[PDB]
Design a binder for this molecule. Structure first.
Ligand SMILES: *[C@@H]1O[C@H](CO)[C@@H](O[C@@H]2O[C@H](CO)[C@@H](O[C@@H]3O[C@H](CO[C@H]4O[C@H](CO[C@H]5O[C@H](CO)[C@@H](O)[C@H](O)[C@@H]5O)[C@@H](O)[C@H](O[C@H]5O[C@H](CO)[C@@H](O)[C@H](O)[C@@H]5O[C@H]5O[C@H](CO)[C@@H](O)[C@H](O)[C@@H]5O)[C@@H]4O)[C@@H](O)[C@H](O[C@H]4O[C@H](CO)[C@@H](O)[C@H](O)[C@@H]4O)[C@@H]3O)[C@H](O)[C@H]2NC(C)=O)[C@H](O)[C@H]1NC(C)=O
Ligand SMILES: *[C@@H]1O[C@H](CO)[C@@H](O[C@@H]2O[C@H](CO)[C@@H](O[C@@H]3O[C@H](CO[C@H]4O[C@H](CO[C@H]5O[C@H](CO)[C@@H](O)[C@H](O)[C@@H]5O)[C@@H](O)[C@H](O[C@H]5O[C@H](CO)[C@@H](O)[C@H](O)[C@@H]5O)[C@@H]4O)[C@@H](O)[C@H](O[C@H]4O[C@H](CO)[C@@H](O)[C@H](O)[C@@H]4O)[C@@H]3O)[C@H](O)[C@H]2NC(C)=O)[C@H](O)[C@H]1NC(C)=O
Ligand SMILES: CCCCCCCC/C=C\CCCCCCCC(=O)O[C@H](COC(=O)CCCCCCCCCCCCCCC)COP(=O)(O)OC[C@@H](O)CO
Ligand SMILES: *[C@@H]1O[C@H](CO)[C@@H](O[C@@H]2O[C@H](CO)[C@@H](O[C@@H]3O[C@H](CO)[C@@H](O)[C@H](O)[C@@H]3O)[C@H](O)[C@H]2NC(C)=O)[C@H](O)[C@H]1NC(C)=O
Ligand SMILES: CCCCCCCCCCCC(=O)OC[C@H](COP(=O)([O-])O)OC(=O)CCCCCCCCCCC
Ligand SMILES: CC(C)CCC[C@@H](C)[C@H]1CC[C@H]2[C@@H]3CC=C4C[C@@H](O)CC[C@]4(C)[C@H]3CC[C@]12C
Ligand SMILES: CCCCCCCCCCCCCCCC
Ligand SMILES: CCCCCCCCCCCCCCCC
Ligand SMILES: CCCCCCCCCCCCCCCC
Ligand SMILES: CC(=O)N[C@@H]1[C@@H](O)[C@H](O)[C@@H](CO)O[C@H]1O
Ligand SMILES: CCCCCCCCCC
Ligand SMILES: CCCCCCCCCC
Ligand SMILES: CCCCCCCCCC
Ligand SMILES: CCCCCC
Ligand SMILES: CCCCCC
Lengths: 217, 62, 330, 117, 125, 264, 117, 115
């Protein structure tokens, strides 16, 4: 979801400003049919002319620049990365509705979901020049990986804990704040929590993510 | 400058501030998720959980 | 206009392009400075890097001294063919050229004291030997070596014009993967059998940015090892679940390694990233072997003592290995 | 920034170890100075330790080996002569520096070990 | 891959403020030859999608079998879609084959979701 | 200043570029000297290696002898068109060039006796056939063949100036995978139908490093094979576990072998 | 280095086997030395063995072959004549040596095997 | 090595057997008694491109098929001047123009048609 302004600059190589002075003609830059341009993976938004006097070692040089504004089209990556990753994260939540006694089924589902997320993550960083910093789609894939990992760990904890084990208008500062009373062997209900807790959280993150890059980015 | 990159922050103090605001945002979003947990857990525990979560978010933000 | 034309003709008339300034006498001192426009590619597979620059050289030729004209004549570039210029060349270069659009990117300027300024816009693919033994936790030394081809120190002398401020534009370079930490200018006289040749050296110390590898390499491996630890906490009789989880973790590790090293540059010798990935592979393999031991000993032929030891040993051992790796290589 | 330490000194085996930015100075060589004589070339060896080159006056009775796990070059001696008595020095040279036989192209020198036979 | 269907010649004077400029054009209409796609990219996806329908005939109590089948056909679909990206031209653009692969992915995902539904309803609570 | 100019002008006068020295006399004895700088990019897929070198040819032309100027001249580029030079070329080349930046990297040096030194800075791509039947445990022997194009051994005779010391800078090469074990110099006369042409040859022996392959390729496969063997200790009654382990080990082996193919 | 051995001295099929770095000397060929007549070119075969070259005097009658089971190079003598009697040698040539018909270009030679019939 | 066998009394057919790939372009020529061979038409390996002479434009058509008989000539609006023997012919890849018969090799057996 990135926009760019590619420049194209030119100037006299040897003649400083006191020897040669370039000048733009009125409406000098002439774009032909914009539909007749080979701009795929990018949409032309416009252009603009400028002019400047650069101070180099040899002397002062008149530099004339033309900027072209280009906006990336997020059509390929919506079907390649965003939708498969979301569907895989949704499939991760299927395990919470399977019966807990189906240990091989849920384990296979979770681990193969992690494997599928790993496979999808490989094609994320294809077009970019291996930039060290994290981009938006990399962050989305990482968060999806964390969700599927969390779901698998959640089932592991549930299985282990269900199968392998048999003074001032308030009250005591410790007990008025901390609800340690009646708290817990209620682990058996964890799936019932997760069925609401795992989807909802994702949606919140998802919402914030898109806002943070679409209207206010 | 963007929080994603860590070679563009002017100083580590801004890095720590952004990190703590991250934890604040995560905590408040976690309690907003916990709103949906009322159907199963009793209210007397869920209100306490968000009380502690909001207090931790406040400490992180300050 | 007539006076300037006649002066230029007089300067170029009776001029030999075949004797250095002050042929019989002290060596001609050539002061040189560079403006680095960009550093585009840094290839480890080829062990080189592409660099575009505004090379500039200054010397003093009394044969091109004129008087009465109070201005610096910036002549057409083709006059460079009609004048003596140094035979400077880049020693560690693999391929280079001078840009020729719209014309030959070349500069000749004759000051009225005989001082000739000669400029060229040059792109060079300079060789940069690299030591990827700590990759990606590595810090390279790339260099550009400038030297006279034919003449020797008794005839031509090189020096960086402006001292340490000769090379400019290094601060504005934004490499995608590396970060330029320092640049150094050095001047020497390399001794050969024929004689001592002047040399200049521009040395950059690139440092690789570990932000891509930490996001793509280390995190998946750590999480997969943690999932093998999750496999440990499952019942012993549930053989299908444990076996599937362990073997699929092994498959995921192999997938990560293959796709990663396919995407990454291919360098055929040991690297730190290989050691980390292989340690993770060995750990996930050991997890499945541990389950095999548990299944054979107890179920084959409730405490599950081996599982109890493993639950503490494997996380501790992996943490120790991780600390050893992050201490040795950092 | 490389620091060299020379050890050792019929059958001898000197061991010049290096510490620091050894990769910047791969071409490592041995010289010897007899008392009252000028320094002379004796041998050289590359980074991979498989490109030895010896002076004609000390050929067929010297050997040079290298190891990088412990950054060291070993100079293994053989049947000597009385002229071999000298202070043996160990030096390092950077890629794109110049010829091997001249000592001025070498930047970082060793302290020098005396050998008498 | 191509097959010249028809070629044309055009001659015209392009009009511009400086003046009319002569111009000629030689055009070809190339039709791409299917067979390296319908046998080769579409067919495996359709076969995998048909395989995903096998789960509906297996008994509802076979949790491991049906879950493994569904998740593994999803994995295979992702594998095909990821490794065809380096097979086809590296031109980011919404092509028809992308729509077909996305449809097949949605179908296998819906099959697995259907198993989730029936397992929750008829076997569990 | 003008004296040397008129001297070289007189030298060029009466000189036949098309004719070698001593057309009817004995052959001109030309010595070759090479200073290597890199053998980088030893490609296995293309069966060639890229080599950068400084290449001197040394001969004695009596037609260019001069006296009265004890200084040895460095008269370079006008002479590069106006003097005869040997027609030496590299037989097993595929593409080569002379470095041109900043100036053309070429040097002609004359001497009062008539001796001529001709230095070039050449990057070439020389073919090197490889026997990969023992790869990655292979050991290759690459060669550079130098030969006169038209002239026969009765006209030009090549030799290695300085004997075995002709080729220098072998220690400067540092390849990623290979390691130069030995370099050899050879001088022969190849008998074609036209006649016996001279030839010089510079051979390198390259030994491949094995550590990368054993780390990445072999014993990972050994580990997967051991994981396959693990099935034998599992109970015979359990069917999903053993079948899943065996078939997934098969899948992992196919993945490993196939991806190793994909970068090799 | 490569060592060449010949055997098999109507139709008398000779056998020529090589031992060593046979890859460095791909082409191998058969020559013959008759009493009083210098060595002459009988035939030649390449590394792959799918290409061969025979002299005019012996064309259409002999068929050199390659198997590589023991680095063997068969000749398949057929349609023998009394004039075709001589000590036959099998030799190896380098990759860049030049023509086939000239014995000077061949490096390693067999001892020779006599055939009389 | 290509052998052409053609049939026709109307749809003329030509079957090429052998190394047909080395001789992609193949065509039809005509000759009447006392006359020289004249180019009728040509078809290429792909089959999506054709070539016809002006005298037989809009009337005769040529088509290509897979397998062996990959040259079919459809005849329409016959005229008495069309009375002639028609030859199938094949040409190599790198050869001259189609119109000239001498560029063709491996000629077929002419089929006689009399309107
Ligand atoms: C990589 O692979 C390549 C192959 O692809 C390897 O290349 C081979 O490397 C070998 C070394 O390892 C070379 O060996 C040497 O070859 C020299 C070639 O010399 C030719 O000319 C010689 C004479 O030249 C001088 O002649 C007179 C001398 O007074 C003067 O005019 C000049 O000074 C000339 O320079 C000549 O002697 C050689 O041989 C042949 O001469 C005629 C030709 O008809 C015949 O008499 C023979 O055919 C003769 O050769 C053979 O016969 C003798 C008989 O005794 C046998 O012993 C031989 O083995 C052979 O079968 C050349 O035509 C040699 O001069 C040189 O000789 C020295 O070493 C040998 C071996 O120890 C001694 O026997 C000699 O006495 C002498 O000390 C040596 O053989 C190969 O030529 C070379 N091959 C190719 C194709 O280039 C490369 O090494 C590999 N390297 C790596 C790094 O892996
Ligand atoms: C990236 O890695 C590369 C790896 O190669 C690394 O390169 C080295 O960088 C260091 C600097 O960090 C270089 O070191 C310096 O060398 C300077 C030049 O030395 C030569 O000249 C000395 C005489 O000065 C004269 O030099 C010329 C002559 O024409 C001219 O400029 C002037 O006339 C000038 O007066 C000469 O003495 C010296 O000789 C060496 O050997 C002799 C014995 O043979 C010995 O007597 C000398 O001591 C010396 O070792 C050489 O020929 C040098 O001036 C400079 O000195 C500084 O240090 C002295 C103290 O020694 C201070 O007093 C002074 O104020 C300076 O601070 C320094 O020694 C080194 O040469 C590079 N390596 C190579 C192979 O070129 C890069 O630095 C790395 N960069 C990054 C960013 O990582
Ligand atoms: C279920 C659980 C979910 C939650 C947990 C999920 C897992 C965790 C995810 C994300 C946090 C990752 C931790 C990051 C810690 C390391 C981050 C770091 O390296 O800091 C650098 C500071 O700069 C500098 O001084 C440069 C020197 C940096 C040296 C850093 C040492 C490496 C420490 C190895 C870390 C091991 C742990 C990794 C586990 C993922 C940033 O510059 P970077 O390097 O980017 O590039 C160079 C720059 O110039 C690019 O522009
Ligand atoms: C002009 O060119 C000539 C020819 O190259 C130069 O003569 C060379 O002079 C040097 C110095 O005497 C000679 O070096 C000597 O080599 C011998 C043999 O290796 C050695 O024993 C001596 O101790 C000394 O180092 C060199 O050999 C000689 N060139 C030749 C081909 O013999 C001359 O010096 C040049 N002019 C100037 C001003 O340098
Ligand atoms: C495109 C897909 C559209 C599908 C929509 C189909 C309508 C489903 C509406 C759900 C309400 C419903 O049908 O009730 C059926 C059962 C009743 O449970 P019980 O009390 O009888 O045991 O309880 C259930 O609700 C069935 C279990 C539903 C869980 C589905 C989990 C998969 C979804 C994961 C993403 C959130
Ligand atoms: C799941 C719940 C509990 C927590 C979710 C926290 C989410 C909303 C957080 C975690 C990491 C965050 C991102 C971290 C970095 C940046 C870069 C900055 O330039 C814009 C905001 C943006 C893109 C953040 C948006 C919000 C974010 C995605
Ligand atoms: C120009 C087209 C851009 C791509 C638009 C998205 C393609 C349609 C995606 C359909 C997602 C279906 C998800 C499955 C559940 C409804
Ligand atoms: C370019 C138009 C605006 C952005 C369109 C994004 C469409 C695809 C988003 C992926 C689905 C996210 C919501 C998933 C809800 C579970
Ligand atoms: C009893 C703790 C919960 C166990 C649930 C399985 C989670 C396994 C993940 C690995 C965590 C290891 C932590 C160290 C435990 C000694
Ligand atoms: C959009 C655009 O054309 N902007 C300016 C234009 O207003 C100006 O007249 C011209 C001359 O400098 O330069 C450009
Ligand atoms: C009434 C039984 C099912 C309730 C499931 C919880 C709500 C749906 C969450 C996606
Ligand atoms: C192709 C999908 C599975 C086919 C099941 C066959 C059912 C047979 C019904 C008679
Ligand atoms: C080969 C991996 C499995 C070996 C199991 C050995 C068990 C023997 C009893 C300790
Ligand atoms: C790479 C070594 C790992 C060892 C784990 C015990
Ligand atoms: C690795 C744990 C082994 C425990 C044996 C009792």
């Amino acid at each position: 979801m990135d926009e760019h302004s590619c420049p194209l600059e030119f100037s006299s190589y040897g003649y400083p400003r006191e020897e040669i002075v370039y000048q733009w003609k009125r409406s000098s830059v002439e774009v032909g049919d914009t539909r007749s341009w080979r701009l795929y993976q990018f949409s032309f938004v416009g252009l603009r002319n400028t002019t400047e006097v650069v101070k180099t070692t040899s002397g002062d040089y008149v530099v004339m620049s033309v900027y072209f504004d280009l906006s990336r089209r997020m059509g390929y990556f919506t079907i390649q990365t965003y939708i498969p990753c979301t569907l895989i994260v949704v499939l991760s939540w299927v395990s919470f509705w399977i019966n807990k006694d189906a240990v091989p089924a849920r384990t296979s589902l979770g681990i193969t979901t992690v494997l599928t997320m790993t496979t999808l993550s490989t094609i994320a960083r294809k077009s970019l020049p291996k930039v060290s910093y994290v981009t938006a789609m990399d962050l989305f894939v990482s968060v999806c990986f964390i969700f599927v990992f969390s779901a698998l760990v959640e089932y592991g904890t549930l299985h282990y804990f269900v199968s392998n084990r048999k003074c001032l208008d308030g009250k005591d500062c410790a007990s008025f704040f901390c609800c340690f009373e009646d708290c817990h062997i209620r682990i058996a209900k964890m799936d019932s929590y997760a069925r609401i807790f795992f989807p909802t959280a994702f949606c919140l993150f998802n919402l914030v993510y898109w806002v943070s890059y679409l209207y206010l980015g | 400058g963007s929080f994603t990159d860590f070679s563009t922050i002017p100083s580590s103090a801004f890095k720590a501030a952004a990190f703590f605001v991250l934890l604040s945002m995560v905590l408040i979003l976690g309690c907003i998720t916990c709103f949906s947990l009322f159907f199963f857990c009793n209210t007397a525990t869920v209100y306490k959980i968000c009380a502690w979560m909001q207090l931790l978010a406040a400490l992180c933000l300050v | 206009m007539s006076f300037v034309k006649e002066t230029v003709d007089k300067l170029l008339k009776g001029y030999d392009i075949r004797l250095r300034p002050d042929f019989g006498g002290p060596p001609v001192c050539v002061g040189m400075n560079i403006d680095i426009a960009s550093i585009d590619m840094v290839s480890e597979v080829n062990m080189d890097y592409t660099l575009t620059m505004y090379f500039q050289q200054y010397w003093r030729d009394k044969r091109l001294a004129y008087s009465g004209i109070p201005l610096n004549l910036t002549l057409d570039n083709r006059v460079a063919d009609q004048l003596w210029v140094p035979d400077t060349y880049f020693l560690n270069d693999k391929k280079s050229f001078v840009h020729g659009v719209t014309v030959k990117n070349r500069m000749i300027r004759l000051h009225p004291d005989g001082t000739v300024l000669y400029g060229l816009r040059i792109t060079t693919t300079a060789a940069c030997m690299m030591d990827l033994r700590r990759y990606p936790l590595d810090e390279q030394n790339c260099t550009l070596e400038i030297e006279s081809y034919g003449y020797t120190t008794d005839d031509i002398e090189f020096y960086w014009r402006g001292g340490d401020k000769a090379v400019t534009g290094v601060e504005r370079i934004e490499l995608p993967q590396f970060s330029i930490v320092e640049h150094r200018l050095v001047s020497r006289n390399v001794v050969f059998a024929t004689g001592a040749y002047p040399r200049l050296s521009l040395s950059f110390r690139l440092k690789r940015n570990i932000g891509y590898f930490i996001l793509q390499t280390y995190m998946p491996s750590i999480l997969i090892t943690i999932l093998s630890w999750v496999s440990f906490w499952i019942n012993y009789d549930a053989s299908a679940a444990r076996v599937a989880l362990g073997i699929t973790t092994v498959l995921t590790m192999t997938t990560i390694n293959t796709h990663l090293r396919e995407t990454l540059p291919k360098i055929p010798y040991v690297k730190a990233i290989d050691m980390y990935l292989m340690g993770c592979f060995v750990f996930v393999f050991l997890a499945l072997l541990e389950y095999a031991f548990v299944n054979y000993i107890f179920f084959g032929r409730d405490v599950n003592a081996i599982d109890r030891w493993s639950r503490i040993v494997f996380p501790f051992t992996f943490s120790l290995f991780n600390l050893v790796y992050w201490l040795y290589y950092v | 920034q490389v620091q060299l330490v020379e050890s050792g000194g019929g059958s001898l085996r000197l061991s010049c170890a290096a510490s620091g930015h050894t990769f910047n100075y791969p071409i490592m060589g041995w010289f010897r100075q007899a008392p009252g004589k000028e320094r002379e070339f004796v041998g050289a060896i590359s980074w991979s330790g498989g490109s030895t080159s010896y002076a004609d006056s000390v050929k067929d009775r010297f050997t040079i080996s290298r190891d990088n796990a412990k950054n060291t070059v070993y100079l293994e001696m053989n049947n000597l002569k009385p002229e071999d008595t000298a202070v043996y020095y160990c030096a390092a040279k950077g890629r794109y520096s110049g010829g091997l036989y001249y000592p001025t192209n070498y930047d970082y020198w060793g302290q020098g070990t005396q050998v008498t036979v």
